[PDB]
Amino acid sequence: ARKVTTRWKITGTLIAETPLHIGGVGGDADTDLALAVNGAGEYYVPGTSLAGALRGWMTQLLNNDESQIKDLWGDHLDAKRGASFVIVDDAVIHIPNNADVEIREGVGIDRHFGTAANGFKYSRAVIPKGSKFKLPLTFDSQDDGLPNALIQLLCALEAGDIRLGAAKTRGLGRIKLDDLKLKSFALDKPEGIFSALLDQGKKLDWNQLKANVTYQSPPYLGISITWNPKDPVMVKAEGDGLAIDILPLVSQVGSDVRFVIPGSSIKGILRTQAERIIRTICQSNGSEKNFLEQLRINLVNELFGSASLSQKQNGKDIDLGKIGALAVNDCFSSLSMTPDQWKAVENATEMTGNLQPALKQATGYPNNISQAYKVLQPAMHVAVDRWTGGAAEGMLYSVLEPIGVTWEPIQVHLDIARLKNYYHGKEEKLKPAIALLLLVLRDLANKKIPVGYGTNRGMGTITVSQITLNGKALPTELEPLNKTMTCPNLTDLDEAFRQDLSTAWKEWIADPIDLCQQ
């Protein structure tokens, strides 16, 4: 057979740090986009999908070097290489107790009218946060020891730097490894070959390998925005309720439900303002374009990403698609409720009756409604008929406004390595993209970007208290970004740095080329 100096079984627990979606073939009558299930109908991570996530990250680590990647993950082309030395099994996903697959609604908002675009309504099934699955790796070493790149991979998993499945830029897919265990079988020797058959192998201390390497995280800029709602902030739930028509969206996070603003929603508001800035500068109208063409404008194609779209642009055939270098996480409330405590709110039927006990429960003031209604407050609204006054027949509706829910800081992750690859390495070309991003954040802090439902109707305006910029391995001319900002107008960034960015930005405004066009 293939000679193997040692077989390493490398195993542990992977946990979903944000909701996952690994897609099947798609569609399931319940949702438009449907989770992969194994032949027993259990949700699982295909080893193809996990193996590609790992091979992908190593390729970004080894600077897209083929030569070393093929020596781990194998090849078909080279006469010397063939089959993969790393083996990745299928792993079933165990969803937390009582928890279940969630459906996330999605909409595309027409950039001209500001309203849902026709046809752009979809829904996605997602594995809730905190679900677990087994890490199922085997490695057949032909040399002695363990490859350092394979050690860096396991360090990256423990750091949670790998994302798996769909919608990776829009909230989903982060996984982190726990309980890593390493079993070595010295298959080259009789004592080792019988160990494989009987003794269940030789333990290695991971901490001893983890001590012999420095984990080289790739360039990124983390942005943490600390904020609180100035007007109630919510994303609307999937459908009308009983006592309350409009209820906030919530998600399972382990034992408790929390209110959630999806990263899809925070990404979408940021993208919209970024585009409006670019189109404003160019005075480029958006009104004659359909929604898929409205989205497709300069710099945002690299930051927020573009749809795959093959084009025979010049007899040469090219793909316009690229992933977003900017990714956004789901933002959850600090407040939490047991799953049944919220089911009592969803199923209240009298706004002054059995709803009042339910909100007193969930808000954590089970005996004090006047404090309960400082957290979640039911509102009633009428449409008033313009000739008669009073109220228009049928037009009475109510909202459960999360007036006082406190929210955790928003995490935006900017992949500087991915942009720099788009610009074929030229870090000069980052400054227009970094300049745009800082202008978007300036508006966020100036209440120019409201979030969630009903922004024009008494909701959605946020106060930003602090933006923390925390990049790793940034190029030296972007190193001034590492800052905590509290002035909305960026005055905490060095004026020489803000003036440098302004210069590269103004030089792009004077000629707004496709900046990744080499």
Partner: protein, 767 residues
């Protein structure tokens, strides 16, 4: 007596380059159309795991004492030879069959074409561009994977040497138990999680491995190989008339490869079993009663070819004097067949000569074309892995195909023995024809996936008795005739054949002179074949094909039917003992004029272990049936109105699409029947508000129809109106699956109807 049992622990893929429908790659499926593991996959995988074990015991030496043991058990790999090897290659001791699903489960599938598809599902796959992070052009595939939890079992045979010491038997068992336990994966995409398995031998456990662990340091070289030489006695009686004819019926229990020729990388197959393949079974069964090897040398024994059974008898190779209408006739059409030994070509219409296949019986007033038999055959494609790259490569050939006769075909041979040899046997065993029942392996690749056949003996048949017509003598070659020229090479000619019969029968023959009637219709044949005892190919045998015909006018003398009978028994020419030379005189199918004629599951028991696996397959077949039927029912506006009361009236929708959407959002919460409180609660609150109830006026009772569909548990199944009998295999499966899938069927049908409504509403709108 040994089996391998395989428990598949993840979804698994095997065997085929072809792809059928919207799937790109499809799994290997057996004769029941059910997925299975081919015996060559199983051997190759198990060998590979035993190779890892031996490679460890040799301390990584790629050649050594323990790789000798692998070559002992699994046979040598010629075509891995790196230098001069003087001994002939050893065959394997271990034969491993194909692994099939549980036979009682396989019976439940019979005819249920929709269920046979549901054993697998599409797995998507995409390849992603590393710099952009988006799917590469071309790099999309959808792949068939069989559901995990399949438990499959294979027959195994260890035909150990007649002398192996008990220490060595324990080593063999030790290695096989060790290699089985080291085996963890098989099939395609192993390295990516497909095809995880448990492979276990019957009667080998950790005790077999533990003995090896305790003793491997003591182990010697394997015993040397030795051929099973023949042994003669010379003691047979002289051959004396009569000749007994014992029909042997062969039935294929697995595909049989009978090499006709290799073209490129595909081995082509015969559509009959040559008699030489049965001499090994004749040696096995009768060589204890008389000297079978002397009987062959004396010609006291004939085993004919096995040809497809028609009319309860051996099918006879189609005579080349038959010609079919080229446009739309011949035996495949069942009309427009002319016997050109007796009929002129009709005016105008051109004919094609018959070229193959077999005909059943025919009688001198048949009034019908003779029954024509066909042999089914299948192409099996294999690969050879180069062990270091673990993929096939040019240095090891890597792709090849066998045509094979598929399973369930039935063939009839005849063993002929002179009376003196039946006396020899019957003096020793009165029941000797009972010993002719056997299961044996014949062909190419006989030791694994291919070649398993049943043999059954019939009762002694009557000797053929041809008509002694003194006007014409006509000869049908029922088998290939090999003649030697007067130089003892095979370059004989049809004039040598005239002299052979002329001399053999004591008659003079001349070609019939009728200008419209063909007298001779031969084709040349060449047989290239190995001989296993020699270890070298046979001398090339040249002759004329079966089906060849010729007819002679008898010039002088008289032909004797006694001698025609004897030649019809013993045949003519070389190697008649293998059934060459078998011939038919004056058969009326050559004599007749033909142009006017025309041709003539049960459920799994409730306690059954696989009942849990069958339930996974059924739900898949039910879900797709419900989805398909829901699509059809939404397509017609009368049915959406029947089922939910919804309708289109001009440009208007009843109710508004918003009202349908509101209902639908609630029905999303109908996960179980005990959630029907949720949906009925919505409807009562709707029904209580006057302005909202009237939104659904001008529907056909829509609110009651929804109330019924949700609260009457029988009603969804009556609207879907699916015959679930072809979709279920578990006993009590129908009532169980109905209760389980109820809420999903309601959600699916309502989802389909509202979609179909909206996209017809768009048409009325856009007028």
């Amino acid at each position: 007596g040994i089996e391998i049992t395989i428990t598949m622990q993840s979804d698994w893929h095997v065997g085929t380059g072809m792809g059928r429908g919207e799937l790109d790659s499809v799994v290997q499926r057996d004769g029941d159309n059910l997925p299975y593991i081919p015996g060559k996959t199983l051997t190759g995988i198990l060998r590979d795991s035993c190779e890892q074990v031996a490679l460890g015991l040799d301390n990584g030496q790629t050649r050594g004492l323990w790789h000798g043991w692998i070559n002992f058990i699994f046979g040598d790999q010629p075509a891995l030879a790196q230098g001069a090897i003087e001994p002939e290659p050893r065959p394997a001791l271990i034969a491993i069959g194909s692994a099939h699903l549980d036979p009682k489960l396989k019976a439940a599938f019979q005819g249920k074409k929709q269920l046979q598809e549901a054993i697998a599902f599409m797995k998507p796959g995409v390849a992603i561009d590393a710099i952009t992070g988006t799917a590469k052009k071309d790099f999309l595939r959808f792949e068939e994977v069989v559901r995990l939890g399949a438990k499959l079992t294979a027959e195994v045979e260890l035909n150990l040497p007649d002398n192996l010491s008990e220490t060595n038997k324990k080593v063999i068992a030790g290695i096989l138990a060790s290699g089985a336990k080291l085996t963890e994966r098989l099939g395609g995409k192993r390295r990516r999680g497909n095809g995880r398995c448990e492979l276990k031998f019957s009667g080998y456990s950790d005790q077999q491995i533990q003995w090896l662990k305790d003793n491997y340091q003591s182990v010697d070289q394997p015993p040397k190989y030795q051929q099973n030489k023949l042994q003669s006695a010379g003691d047979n009686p002289e051959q004396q008339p009569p000749w007994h004819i014992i029909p042997l019926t062969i039935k294929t229990l697995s595909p049989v490869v009978l090499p006709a020729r290799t073209v490129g990388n595909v081995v082509e197959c015969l559509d009959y079993i040559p008699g030489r393949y049965l001499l090994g079974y004749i040696h096995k069964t009768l060589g204890e009663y008389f000297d079978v090897s002397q009987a062959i040398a004396a010609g006291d024994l004939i085993i004919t070819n096995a040809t497809i059974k028609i009319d309860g008898k051996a099918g006879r190779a189609t005579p080349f004097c038959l010609f079919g209408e080229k446009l739309d006739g011949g035996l495949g059409k069942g009309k427009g067949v002319y016997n050109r030994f007796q009929e002129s070509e009709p005016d105008g219409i051109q004919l094609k000569g018959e070229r193959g296949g077999y005909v059943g019986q025919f009688e001198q007033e048949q009034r019908n074309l003779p029954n024509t038999g066909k042999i089914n055959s299948e192409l099996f494609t294999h690969n050879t892995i180069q062990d270091d790259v673990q993929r096939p490569t040019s240095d090891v050939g890597g792709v090849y195909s066998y045509e094979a006769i598929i399973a369930g075909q039935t063939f009839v041979a005849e063993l002929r023995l002179p009376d003196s040899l039946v006396k020899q046997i019957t003096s020793k065993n009165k029941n000797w024809q009972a010993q002719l029942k056997a299961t044996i392996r014949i062909g190419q690749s006989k030791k694994d996936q291919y070649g398993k056949i049943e043999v059954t003996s019939g009762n002694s048949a009557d000797l053929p008795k041809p008509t002694g017509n003194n006007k014409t003598l006509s000869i049908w070659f029922l088998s290939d005739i090999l003649l030697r020229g007067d130089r003892l090479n095979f370059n004989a000619t049809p004039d040598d054949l005239k002299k052979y019969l002329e001399n053999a029968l004591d008659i003079k023959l001349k070609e019939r002179s009728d200008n419209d009637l063909i007298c001779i219709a031969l084709r040349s044949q060449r047989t290239e074949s190995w001989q296993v005892r020699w270890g070298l190919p046979r001398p090339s045998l040249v002759g004329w094909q079966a089906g060849s015909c010729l007819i002679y006018d008898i010039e002088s003398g008289t032909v004797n039917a006694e001698k025609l009978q004897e030649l019809m028994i013993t045949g003519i020419g070389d190697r008649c003992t293998e059934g060459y030379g078998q011939i038919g005189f004056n058969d009326p199918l050559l004599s007749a004029s033909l142009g006017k004629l025309t041709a003539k599951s049960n459920p799994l028991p409730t306690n059954h272990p696989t009942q849990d696996y069958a339930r996974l397959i059924e739900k898949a077949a039910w879900r797709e049936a419900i989805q398909n039927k829901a699509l059809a029912l939404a397509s017609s506006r009368a049915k959406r109105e029947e089922i939910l009361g919804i309708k289109i009236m001009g440009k208007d929708s009843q109710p508004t699409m918003t009202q349908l959407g509101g209902f639908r959002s609630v029905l999303k919460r109908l996960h179980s029947r005990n959630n029907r409180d949720i949906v009925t609660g919505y409807l009562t609150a709707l029904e209580q508000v006057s302005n909202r109830k009237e939104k659904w006026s001008n529907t056909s009772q829509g609110l009651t129809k929804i109330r019924n569909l949700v609260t009457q548990e029988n009603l969804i199944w009556n609207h879907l109106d699916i015959d679930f009998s072809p979709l279920t295999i578990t006993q009590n499966g129908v009532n169980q699956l109905k209760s389980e899938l109820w809420a999903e069927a309601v959600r699916t049908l309502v989802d389909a109807i509202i979609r179909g409504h909206k996209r017809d509403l768009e048409k009325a709108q856009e007028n």
